[PDB]
């Protein structure tokens, strides 16, 4: 809740990479838990957690798209704190998504 520091890791599996969920160790968090990741005072990025046994405690595995969007590097230190939504105001009704072929 208050936020803890740890080291970013690489996404363990292709399925979890496609899930777009930050892969965590069961000992650290739980599947479905939601967090805010601080990399600096001006850099906060919002993630949803999913547990995987292979994750080492004290680390979170992120996919390449997640690393690029959040600018996270394997081995870098980051803080992360559990974040709770205000479902009465933050629940999503409509999403406009820009789509393109991932590979030319």
């Amino acid at each position: 809740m208050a936020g803890r520091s740890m080291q970013a890791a690489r996404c363990p599996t292709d399925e979890l990479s496609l899930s777009n969920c930050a892969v965590v160790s069961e000992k650290d968090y739980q599947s479905g838990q939601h967090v805010i990741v601080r990399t600096s005072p001006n850099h906060k990025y919002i993630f949803t957690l999913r547990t995987h046994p292979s994750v080492v405690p004290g680390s979170v595995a992120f996919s390449l798209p997640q690393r690029k969007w959040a600018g996270l590097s394997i081995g870098q230190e980051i803080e992360v704190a559990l974040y709770s939504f205000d479902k009465a105001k933050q629940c999503i009704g409509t999403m406009t998504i820009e789509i393109d072929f991932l590979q030319k």
């Binding site: 590097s73 394997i74 081995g75």
Partner: protein
């Protein structure tokens, strides 16, 4: 020729004379031992000359003499250097201990450098060489001899990158380059060190190398103009597409313009092998 037999017989006679003189129980015995060891050295009997030198050093140290004792210990160490490296290491360790006791740190650092050299060249051991080089660098930096410390740190970082993890190499290269940029005479070479550091980051991951090169380019504007910066940017782009042919073409072109250290070749081969 007459030299071998004559000098050997004279050395044995002098050793026996010194042994008899001590049997009477003293500086005369030490002088005889030193002369006999010298003749042994002329006779090419490299072995057993260090033995006589060590005996003389012990006899002289018996009477509280330390300077000449240390000099003769170092003499025996270098004499055994070719005949028996291990006893040379031991004699040099003794001399280093005594010299550090009196606080002549430059002599101790030089002897540590020699010990690391003999350890790395004749015997096969890197960790002992790394430790000795680090000790010599610490001694010199305590004596504020910047050039020698930089040389030792560069060697240690090179070996650590060669076998050990890259964090030590990253740290040493970054520190040395940062110290080197400001220097008026040495500024021109700074690029090199930085470049090396970046390559080590690549061995870990491409994104770490990208962030490191971005930080270096920001810190050192001249680095942007370096042909090295362009080469790494091109290589990183080629790697990001899992395209080995571009990797090979860029490496070959750069080698064509300028020859390779054979260290860059090793690192580039390692990086290429892991491109998959």
């Amino acid at each position: 020729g007459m030299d071998t037999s004559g000098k050997q017989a004279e050395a044995m006679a002098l050793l026996a004379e010194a042994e008899r003189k001590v049997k009477n129980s003293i500086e005369e015995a030490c002088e005889i031992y030193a002369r006999a060891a010298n003749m042994f050295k002329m006779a090419k009997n490299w072995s057993a000359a260090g033995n006589a030198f060590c005996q003389a050093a012990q006899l002289h140290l018996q009477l509280q003499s330390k300077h000449d004792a240390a000099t003769c210990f170092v003499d025996a160490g270098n004499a055994f250097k070719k005949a028996d490296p291990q006893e040379a290491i031991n004699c040099l360790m003794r001399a280093i201990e005594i010299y550090t006791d009196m606080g002549r740190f430059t002599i101790a650092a030089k002897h540590h450098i020699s010990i690391a050299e003999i350890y790395e060249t004749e015997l096969v051991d890197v960790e002992k060489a790394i430790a000795h080089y680090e000790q010599s660098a610490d001694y010199y930096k305590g004596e504020e001899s910047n050039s020698s410390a930089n040389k030792c740190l560069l060697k240690v970082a090179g070996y650590a990158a060669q076998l050990e993890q890259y964090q030590k190499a990253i740290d040493i290269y970054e520190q040395v380059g940062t110290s080197a940029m400001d220097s008026p005479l040495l500024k021109y070479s700074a690029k090199d060190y930085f470049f090396k550091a970046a390559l080590c980051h690549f061995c870990i991951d491409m994104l770490n190398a990208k962030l490191a090169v971005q930080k270096y380019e920001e810190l050192f504007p001249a680095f942007s103009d370096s042909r090295e910066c362009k080469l790494m940017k091109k290589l990183l782009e080629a790697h990001e597409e899992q395209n080995v042919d571009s990797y090979t073409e860029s490496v070959k072109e750069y080698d064509s313009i300028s020859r390779l250290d054979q260290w860059l070749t090793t690192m580039l081969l390692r990086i290429k092998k892991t491109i998959q």
